[PDB]
């Protein structure tokens, strides 16, 4: 079981989907004594267990699969901490790259970083859109077989910014002069004017 | 090198044929993603010399057959 | 049939808050975005496997605290096979690859807990001994 | 403990008796146990003290006669060595690491206690011969 004294646990909460709690007395085979951040004991009941929490060394790692307990609140915690306190907008899950839209401009897109990623292997670095673009750009050279980057989300999330920088990366590591970046970016207003809508829940 | 920009899975208070199409497309893409991840895992396991039988494959084809197949 | 001709690479974008505040993160929105992008069911599928993959030397570095100085061999792979086969009795929790240990979800946290518990018991024993030494010396001062 | 033991222990107790009433505080009971060469945990001391509350722990006073059963109850090397070898395998231990763990884990001590006992026992690299320091502090 290993619900021991000073085991941390996650508990479901209406206001923020999960809150951290600490198991204030050992579990033994109905109700748990839980110490909360808000108050030293408020009590939680077990039904016909709370999600256990990862150890502090693991949280904040570059790749959500490095966690030992894989579940909604630990993922949400790792993304929240990495975004809020370290201002890292990029994180890995399995193969996938998760990009948390900061709504703020950042120095991380500079040409020195483009050089820093060029020629690296994928795991050698903290995740960045340039490291996906580089993995594609190397596999295209190593093999005949073509490559795709697939970007998914809501339209507000800023997929166009991801594609913009992935093209800037391709242009710079190719050493190209050509002029594709300007034209592809200048195509966006017509494609958005014809092909783009205001929904009940999102605009554009 | 292709850059594909597409909408995600979609769900609203009131839910209609537009969403049904979007969710069908996202079912197809998630099937492709599961194909790809499973393949690269069988490759990594043979890199590490570990028996393939330990990785279970999760398959959403029973859901796609509910939509696109005949009498769907 | 266009994408199947090709090798995919995937990105997911999530919207952290509905109001475009810089660097603020609404858990209630973000959970929904992560579900909608399939990230959560992806992680649920990954947790069924061996998620956690550790190189023998970094494992040995981390868990020598649990390892008796008798039992570390010159052979890292055999050393770790011994140690881990004692520490986690159900062999089904891990596989010994050529280059990496594979752990099921949860077991690396278990190993970290039992490591921390050993380190705590050792620290308590040492530090209580140092406390009793030091106050024994304060007693010798009071006798003086 | 016999009468001779009780007399030597009582004299020591009175040296720790800072009020003259022949009594110590709960918080001094552990101090007296430690003064006699024992290394009891805070938990063992509180258990033999009867898990006192903060108020009586800081102000209720007990004489030697009440302490004695508690000292008895508390009373009733290779593991210690391995405990020090955790933080090593060249036979050394960083002074910084031992200081941090002793002041932040377990029954945390003050930086001044650790500096006082460690003064002169660590070398220029900031390494402690833990077998020699341990034998020294166990004598």
Output the 3-class SS for chain C. CCHHHCEEEEEEEECCCCCCCCCCCCHHHHHHHHHHCCHHHHHHHHHCCCCEEEEHHHHHHHHHHHCCCCCCCCCHHHHHHHHHHHHCCCHHHEEECCCEEEECCCHHHHHHHHHHHHHHHHHHHHHHHHHHHHHHHHHHHHHC
Considering the domain architecture, whether residues D53 and D91 belong to the same structural domain is answered as no
For residue D66, the enclosing domain spans 2-77
Cβ neighbours of A98 (radius 10 Å): 24
Chain B interface test: which of C1, C3, C37, C56 (most B C-beta within 10 Å): C3
Cβ neighbours of D33 (radius 10 Å): 23
Subunits next to A (3 or more Cβ pairs <8 Å) are B, C
Measure the CA–CA gap between C39 and C28, rounded to whole angstroms.
Answer: 15
Q: Please, which residues 30-69 of chain B have a Cβ atom closer than 8 Å to chain A?
A: 36-37, 40
SS3 A79: helix
β-sheet bridge partners, residue A35: A22
Residue C3 contacts by C-beta under 8 Å, 6 or more apart in sequence?
A: A148, A150, B4, B32
Considering the domain architecture, whether residues D84 and D30 belong to the same structural domain is answered as no
Task: Give the dihedral of Cα atoms D30, A4, C67, C112; nearest 10 deg.
Answer: -120
Provide the token pair at D139.
Answer: 């004598």
Number of domains in chain D: 2
Q: Please, which residues 79-98 of chain C have a Cβ atom closer than 8 Å to chain B?
A: 95, 97-98
Q: Which residue has the tokens 């660590």?
A: D122
Phi then psi for C125, rounded to 5 degrees?
-60, -50
Provide the token pair at A180.
Answer: 């594709």
Considering the domain architecture, whether residues D71 and D115 belong to the same structural domain is answered as no
Considering the domain architecture, whether residues D22 and D42 belong to the same structural domain is answered as yes
Chain D interface test: which of C135, C137, C144 (most D C-beta within 10 Å): C135
- Count how many Cα atoms sit within 13 Å of the Cα of residue A197 in the half-sphere of its side chain: 6
Measure the CA–CA gap between D80 and A7, rounded to whole angstroms.
Answer: 27
Provide the token pair at B10.
Answer: 């979609």
Does C127 sit within 8 Å of D33, measured CB to CB?
no
Chain C interface test: which of D28, D86, D101 (most C C-beta within 10 Å): D86
Measure the CA–CA gap between A55 and C117, rounded to whole angstroms.
Answer: 13
Phi then psi for B66, rounded to 5 degrees?
-65, -25
Residue of D115, D29, D135, D139 whose CA lies nearest to D73: D29
Please check if A118 is assigned to a binding site.
no
Measure the CA–CA gap between A83 and D69, rounded to whole angstroms.
Answer: 58
Q: Which residue has the tokens 């099937």?
A: B31
Distance from the Cα of residue B47 to its chain's centroid: 25
Considering the domain architecture, whether residues D108 and D56 belong to the same structural domain is answered as no
Resolution in A: 3.2
Residue of D18, D26, D58, D61 whose CA lies nearest to D45: D26
Of C119, C120, C123, which has the smallest distance from its Cβ to D102's Cβ? C123
**B10, A157 Cβ separation under 8 angstroms:** no
**C124: chain D residues, CB-CB within 8 Å:** 41, 105-107
Q: Please say which residue of D77, D108, D127 terminates a domain.
A: D77
Does B2 sit within 8 Å of A146, measured CB to CB?
yes
Do A and B make contact via 3 or more CB pairs under 8 A? The reply is yes
Does D113 sit within 8 Å of C65, measured CB to CB?
no
What letter does residue A63 receive in the DSSP assignment? B
CA distance readout (Å), B43 to A139, A145, B56, C4, D17: 16, 17, 14, 18, 75
Q: Please say which residue of D77, D101, D127 terminates a domain.
A: D77
Considering the domain architecture, whether residues D112 and D59 belong to the same structural domain is answered as no
Decide the pairing of beta strands C52-55 and C100-103: antiparallel
Considering the domain architecture, whether residues D8 and D68 belong to the same structural domain is answered as yes
Q: Please say which residue of D37, D54, D77 terminates a domain.
A: D77
Considering the domain architecture, whether residues D23 and D66 belong to the same structural domain is answered as yes
Does C135 sit within 8 Å of D15, measured CB to CB?
no
**C34, A157 Cβ separation under 8 angstroms:** no
Phi then psi for A141, rounded to 5 degrees?
-80, -40
Considering the domain architecture, whether residues D9 and D49 belong to the same structural domain is answered as yes
Considering the domain architecture, whether residues D71 and D83 belong to the same structural domain is answered as no
B4 in A contact zone (CB under 8 Å): yes
Considering the domain architecture, whether residues D62 and D90 belong to the same structural domain is answered as no
**A58, A67 Cβ separation under 8 angstroms:** yes
Considering the domain architecture, whether residues D7 and D73 belong to the same structural domain is answered as yes
Edge-to-edge order in the sheet of strand A31-36: A8-12, A18-23, A31-36, A42-45
**C48, B56 Cβ separation under 8 angstroms:** yes
């Amino acid at each position: 079981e290993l619900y021991t004294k000073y085991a941390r646990v996650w508990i479901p909460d209406p206001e923020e989907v999960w809150k951290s709690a600490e198991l204030l007395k050992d579990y033994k085979p109905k109700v748990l004594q839980l110490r909360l951040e808000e108050g030293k004991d408020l009590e939680y009941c077990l039904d016909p267990l709370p999600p256990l929490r990862n150890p502090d060394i693991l949280v904040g790692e570059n790749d959500l699969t490095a966690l030992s307990y894989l579940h909604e609140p630990a993922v949400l915690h790792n993304l929240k901490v990495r975004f809020i306190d370290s201002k890292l907008i990029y994180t890995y899950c399995g193969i996938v790259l998760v990009a948390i839209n900061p709504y703020e401009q950042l120095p991380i897109y500079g040409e020195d970083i483009i050089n820093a990623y060029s020629g690296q292997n994928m795991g050698d670095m903290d995740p960045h859109i340039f490291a996906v673009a580089e993995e594609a750009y190397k596999q295209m050279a190593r093999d005949e077989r073509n490559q795709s980057i697939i970007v998914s989300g809501e339209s507000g999330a800023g997929k166009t910014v991801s594609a913009k920088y992935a093209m800037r990366y391709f242009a710079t590591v190719s050493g190209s002069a050509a002029n594709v970046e300007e034209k592809v970016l200048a195509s966006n207003p017509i494609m958005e004017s014809i092909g783009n809508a205001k929904t009940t829940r999102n605009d554009n | 090198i292709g850059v594909l920009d597409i909408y995600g899975f979609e769900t609203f208070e009131i839910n209609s044929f537009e969403q049904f199409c979007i969710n069908y497309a996202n079912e197809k893409l998630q099937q492709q993603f599961n194909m790809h991840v499973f393949k690269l895992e069988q490759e990594e396991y043979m890199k590490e010399q570990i028996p393939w039988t330990l990785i279970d494959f999760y398959d959403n084809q029973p859901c796609i057959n509910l939509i696109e197949a005949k009498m769907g | 049939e266009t994408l199947n001709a090709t090798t995919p690479h995937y990105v997911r974008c999530i919207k952290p808050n509905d109001f475009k505040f810089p660097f603020t993160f609404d858990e209630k929105r973000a959970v929904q975005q992560l579900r909608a992008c399939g990230v959560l069911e992806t992680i649920r599928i990954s947790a069924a496997g061996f998620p956690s993959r550790w190189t023998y030397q970094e494992f040995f570095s981390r868990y020598r605290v649990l390892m008796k100085q008798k039992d570390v061999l010159s052979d890292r792979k055999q050393t770790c096979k011994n140690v881990l086969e004692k520490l986690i009795l159900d062999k089904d929790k891990y596989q010994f690859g050529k280059t990496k240990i594979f752990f099921r979800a949860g077991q690396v946290a278990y190993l970290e807990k039992i490591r921390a518990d050993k380190l705590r018991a050792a620290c308590i024993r040492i530090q209580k001994t140092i406390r009793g030494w030091l106050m024994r010396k304060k007693y010798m001062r009071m006798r003086r | 403990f016999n009468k001779d033991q009780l007399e030597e222990f009582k004299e020591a107790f009175e040296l720790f008796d800072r009020v003259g009433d022949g009594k110590i505080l709960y918080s001094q009971c552990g101090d007296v146990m430690r003064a006699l060469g024992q290394n009891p945990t805070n938990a063992e001391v509180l258990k033999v003290l009867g898990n006192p509350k903060s108020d009586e722990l800081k102000s209720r006073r007990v004489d030697f006669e009440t302490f004695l059963p508690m000292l008895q109850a508390v009373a009733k090397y290779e593991d210690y060595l391995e405990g020090f070898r955790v933080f090593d395998g060249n036979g050394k231990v960083m002074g910084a690491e031992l200081r941090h763990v002793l002041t932040t884990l377990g029954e945390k001590m003050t930086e001044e206690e650790v500096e006082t006992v460690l003064a002169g026992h660590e070398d220029s690299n900031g390494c402690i011969n833990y077998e020699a320091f341990l034998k020294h502090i166990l004598s």
